[PDB]
Amino acid sequence: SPNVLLQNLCCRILVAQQFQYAVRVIGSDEFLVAEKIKKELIRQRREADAALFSELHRKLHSQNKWSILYLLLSLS
Amino acid sequence: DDRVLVTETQVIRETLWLLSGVKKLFIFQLIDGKVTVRNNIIVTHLTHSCLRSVLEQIAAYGQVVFRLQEFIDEVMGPFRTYQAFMWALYKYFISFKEELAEIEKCIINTTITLAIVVDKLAPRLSQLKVLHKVFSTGVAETRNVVRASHLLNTLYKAILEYD
Amino acid sequence: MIHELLLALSGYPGSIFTWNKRSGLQVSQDFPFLHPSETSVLNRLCRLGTDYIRFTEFIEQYTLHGIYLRAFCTGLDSVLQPYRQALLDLEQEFLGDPHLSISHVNYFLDQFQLLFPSVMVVVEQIKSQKIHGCQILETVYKHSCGGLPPVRSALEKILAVCHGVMYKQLSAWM
Amino acid sequence: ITEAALVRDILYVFQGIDNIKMNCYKVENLSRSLRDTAVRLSELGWLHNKIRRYTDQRSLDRSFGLVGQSFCAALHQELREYYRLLSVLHSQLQSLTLRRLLVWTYDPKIRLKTLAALVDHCQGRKGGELASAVHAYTKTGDPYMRSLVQHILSLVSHPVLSFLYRWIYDGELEDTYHEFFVASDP
Amino acid sequence: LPGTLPLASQESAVVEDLLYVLVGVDGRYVSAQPLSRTFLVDPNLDLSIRELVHRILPVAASYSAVTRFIEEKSSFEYGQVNHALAAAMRTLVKEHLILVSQLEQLHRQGLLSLQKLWFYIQPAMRTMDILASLATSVDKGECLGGSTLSLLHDRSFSYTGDSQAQELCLYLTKAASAPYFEVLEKWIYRGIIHDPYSEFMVEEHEYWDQRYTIVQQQIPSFLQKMADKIL
Amino acid sequence: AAAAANLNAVRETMDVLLEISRILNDMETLSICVRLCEQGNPEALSSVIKELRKATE
């Protein structure tokens, strides 16, 4: 299942060599992440967006979470 | 005390009928030529009293349109002036009715609630209030020459007020 | 209770929000379901509702006479239009997500809370001094040179339509 | 007295509305490791009640003038922002704790410390003399304050540059209140 | 009463107490004493805890002596450099008020043993030990203007091989010298010298060898080579 | 009924995640990333995504 999902992601991003490299790479808290995101937003500033992000984070909890936030922060 | 606990959309449909000038409605049951809200109507919200408040205002508008419909009725069932006057009033109602009827279409087929249909009807509930004062001088009066002169002269006076 | 409030801010008082002829809109007393700390912000929120009610009651009453008073009320509804339109919106946002509290509703009014107060005494000077005739086109103008940008942009609209009367009469005579 | 109750009251002390009552907000049991952080966090309300009262007391009399009012009005667009942040924080109380709140309200303890100290340096200043006492807060260097006050100056100095562009191209000065530095003699 | 309390559990009580003293507010067991801040822990505690607690507290004392430099050196009787040095030294204290929050969230889950604390604070024990050495070498000899910029060019050369305490002292100097360098851009490209507080290297007077005179104290010791071409 | 409610919750969560991505800045790529993140690490996935983007360029 996970391997199939990784192959689908590689196809969306784009071949076989790239998929092999991705497989090799794969083979190779929440509050802190939120604070880091706010600090990154401050560096970018801006302030209004940070307030909106705090409201959005609360909404997600109302409707694992740390891993998704970390990936988004890395993309920046 | 018991209450009927009507739904929400049902009220707007009833309000449209009151605007149309139809009688014998589960809400706004008139007694003596004066439309009046019932007493057991309640929604899940609005604490049973604001509803009696908001309906009480629309009721005041029903009186303006119910009395006029009573007037047009007493001409259909050779004055040549009242009969020629209602045809102007009657012509206005058909066009006004079309806007109210159209809204009913968008109810059966977008969200719609109370505070939206009222503000949508602002340029009509304004034009209607004028008729309650123009017609009030065409109903408070015996000879056929004074009832038609005093009416036709009230308009030409009431227009110069709005110039 | 949300849709209950959004009607109280429209001009329809009920059991939760009683109406008094002298003071104005205000909350009746403590309610068990809600918190006892909100009983304040609502009272801060009603200081706005009282303005709209005392506005529309005067607007309808038309009271004194004269065209320049008729047109002033005719224009007074135009500046009051964004208030209504911004109130219809609050219901739409609450219809989407059911996690919004009174805090956000109080926050949405923002601009109306700092506008009505300054445009309240302009009405009071009229009904308390019998300002008859074209003298309104100064009493409103003497308050048009105010510092508050929102106000400076509101009364100017009323003066922009009130001049339409003079401009009508002036051209009719010349 | 749980930790969820204090967060329930603190979100109201941030506004002026009072366990926590009213110059410090003395709280009145609970452990010492809680009272201390509450006293510290509530310091934001005492900075908020004072700024709101100043704008209100002056928004009553018309004696302040055109320049003064503009500055007073500028203190509301910098309060709607403070009234929005509370709404987002309010929606999460249904999780956040005192430690979480500290990293949330560490910045608006500064903006509510320049504004609450900008309305005391200019108390009796009516007219251009006010627009000259909110400019003596730009010589500060702090890149966060010098970029806040240098915005309130851009609003307060708009009426002043309204007389100037009037008294230069048309020569018709008009100010019932004496603000412009050009005084006429009847 | 930690004496009548079990061993493996009372450690989780100190780590929550100690998890506050790192912020400044007084704790339940690890209290503060009136004023270089000296603490007291308890008379009856396990020997293999206090000897470990007393190893962390040198990050509390090095914080009860930096926040007392921020809340003080921001006054107007210090110049435009002892201000920026106290602002750029305030962004860091914020980044320490966050490194206290993440552990708190983790503790709400039991994942923070005392032995685990003594590892996470290792960087926050070395940064708060530089800012607590400039805040005591700026007050030893009264420095304002230039001499408080000579110090931040020598305390940054003494760490020429650390690279973890030189990327820091190069963030303070690069920030505590913009206000000094914004009047220099008015004295070279124009003749006007604002310098409200007497801190710039050149001061004017009221036939021309006495008007502008080089002041010897307020020379940044990295413009010493060009102390003449400026004037 | 219960299945329909679960589908609505998933759609609402996806919309909220998209808004957060836009602020820090597609939907199909985000859905694939979210599923992978739920299974299991996060830093490694970010590195692979960056490398793939470089290859596409």
UniProtKB/Swiss-Prot annotation, chain A:
Residue ranges of the TM segments: none
Domain of life: Eukaryota
Subcellular localization(s) per the UniProt record: Cytoplasm, Cytoskeleton, Microtubule organizing center, Centrosome
Organ and tissue specificity: Ubiquitously expressed.
Assembly and interaction partners: Component of the gamma-tubulin ring complex (gTuRC) consisting of TUBGCP2, TUBGCP3, TUBGCP4, TUBGCP5 and TUBGCP6 and gamma-tubulin TUBG1 or TUBG2. TUBGCP2, TUBGCP3, TUBGCP4, TUBGCP5 and TUBGCP6 assemble in a 5:5:2:1:1 stoichiometry; each is associated with a gamma-tubulin, thereby arranging 14 gamma-tubulins in a helical manner. Gamma-tubulin at the first position is blocked by TUBGCP3 at the last position, allowing 13 protafilaments to grow into a microtubule.
Cited function: Component of the gamma-tubulin ring complex (gTuRC) which mediates microtubule nucleation. The gTuRC regulates the minus-end nucleation of alpha-beta tubulin heterodimers that grow into microtubule protafilaments, a critical step in centrosome duplication and spindle formation.
Recorded family membership: Belongs to the TUBGCP family.
Name used for this protein in its record: Gamma-tubulin complex component 3
UniProt source species: Homo sapiens (Human)
Full-sequence range covered: 8 to 101 of 907
UniProtKB/Swiss-Prot annotation, chain B:
Subcellular location: Cytoplasm, Cytoskeleton, Microtubule organizing center, Centrosome
Superkingdom as given in the UniProt entry: Eukaryota
Tissue-wise expression: Widely expressed, with highest levels in heart and skeletal muscle and moderate levels in brain.
Coiled-coil portions: none
Function: Component of the gamma-tubulin ring complex (gTuRC) which mediates microtubule nucleation. The gTuRC regulates the minus-end nucleation of alpha-beta tubulin heterodimers that grow into microtubule protafilaments, a critical step in centrosome duplication and spindle formation.
Binding partners and assembly: Component of the gamma-tubulin ring complex (gTuRC) consisting of TUBGCP2, TUBGCP3, TUBGCP4, TUBGCP5 and TUBGCP6 and gamma-tubulin TUBG1 or TUBG2. TUBGCP2, TUBGCP3, TUBGCP4, TUBGCP5 and TUBGCP6 assemble in a 5:5:2:1:1 stoichiometry; each is associated with a gamma-tubulin, thereby arranging 14 gamma-tubulins in a helical manner. Gamma-tubulin at the first position is blocked by TUBGCP3 at the last position, allowing 13 protafilaments to grow into a microtubule.
Family: Belongs to the TUBGCP family.
Name of the protein in its database record: Gamma-tubulin complex component 5
Gene name per UniProt: TUBGCP5
Included range, full protein: 260 to 448 of 1024
UniProtKB/Swiss-Prot annotation, chain C:
Compartments it resides in: Cytoplasm, Cytoskeleton, Microtubule organizing center, Centrosome
UniProt keyword Transferase, yes or no: no
GO-annotated molecular function: gamma-tubulin binding; structural constituent of cytoskeleton
Top-level taxonomic group: Eukaryota
Keywords: Cytoplasm, Cytoskeleton, Intellectual disability, Microtubule, Primary microcephaly
Biological process, per Gene Ontology: cytoplasmic microtubule organization; meiotic cell cycle; microtubule nucleation; mitotic cell cycle; protein-containing complex assembly; spindle assembly
Tissues expressing this chain: Ubiquitously expressed.
Main location, first listed in the record: cytoplasm
Subunit structure, as described in the record: Component of the gamma-tubulin ring complex (gTuRC) consisting of TUBGCP2, TUBGCP3, TUBGCP4, TUBGCP5 and TUBGCP6 and gamma-tubulin TUBG1 or TUBG2. TUBGCP2, TUBGCP3, TUBGCP4, TUBGCP5 and TUBGCP6 assemble in a 5:5:2:1:1 stoichiometry; each is associated with a gamma-tubulin, thereby arranging 14 gamma-tubulins in a helical manner. Gamma-tubulin at the first position is blocked by TUBGCP3 at the last position, allowing 13 protafilaments to grow into a microtubule.
Family, as annotated: Belongs to the TUBGCP family.
Role: Component of the gamma-tubulin ring complex (gTuRC) which mediates microtubule nucleation. The gTuRC regulates the minus-end nucleation of alpha-beta tubulin heterodimers that grow into microtubule protafilaments, a critical step in centrosome duplication and spindle formation.
Designated name of the protein: Gamma-tubulin complex component 4
Organism this protein belongs to: Homo sapiens (Human)
Gene that encodes it: TUBGCP4
Curated annotation (Swiss-Prot), chain F:
Keywords tagged on the record: Acetylation, Cytoplasm, Cytoskeleton
Locations listed in the record: Cytoplasm, Cytoskeleton, Microtubule organizing center, Centrosome; Cytoplasm, Cytoskeleton, Spindle
Name by which UniProt lists this protein: Mitotic-spindle organizing protein 1
Chief location of this protein within or outside the cell: cytoplasm
An annotated GO cellular component: cytosol
Biological processes annotated in GO: gamma-tubulin complex localization; microtubule nucleation by interphase microtubule organizing center; mitotic spindle assembly
Family label: Belongs to the MOZART1 family.
Signal sequence, start to end: none
Lineage: Eukaryota, Metazoa, Chordata, Craniata, Vertebrata
Residues of the whole record sequence present: 12 to 72 of 82
Coiled-coil regions listed: none
Reported function: Required for the recruitment and the assembly of the gamma-tubulin ring complex (gTuRC) at the centrosome. The gTuRC regulates the minus-end nucleation of alpha-beta tubulin heterodimers that grow into microtubule protafilaments, a critical step in centrosome duplication and spindle formation.
Oligomeric form and interacting partners: Associates with the gamma-tubulin ring complex (gTuRC) consisting of TUBGCP2, TUBGCP3, TUBGCP4, TUBGCP5 and TUBGCP6 and gamma-tubulin TUBG1 or TUBG2; within the complex, interacts with TUBGCP3 and TUBGCP6 to form a luminal bridge with actin that stabilizes the initial structure during complex assembly. Interacts with TUBG1.
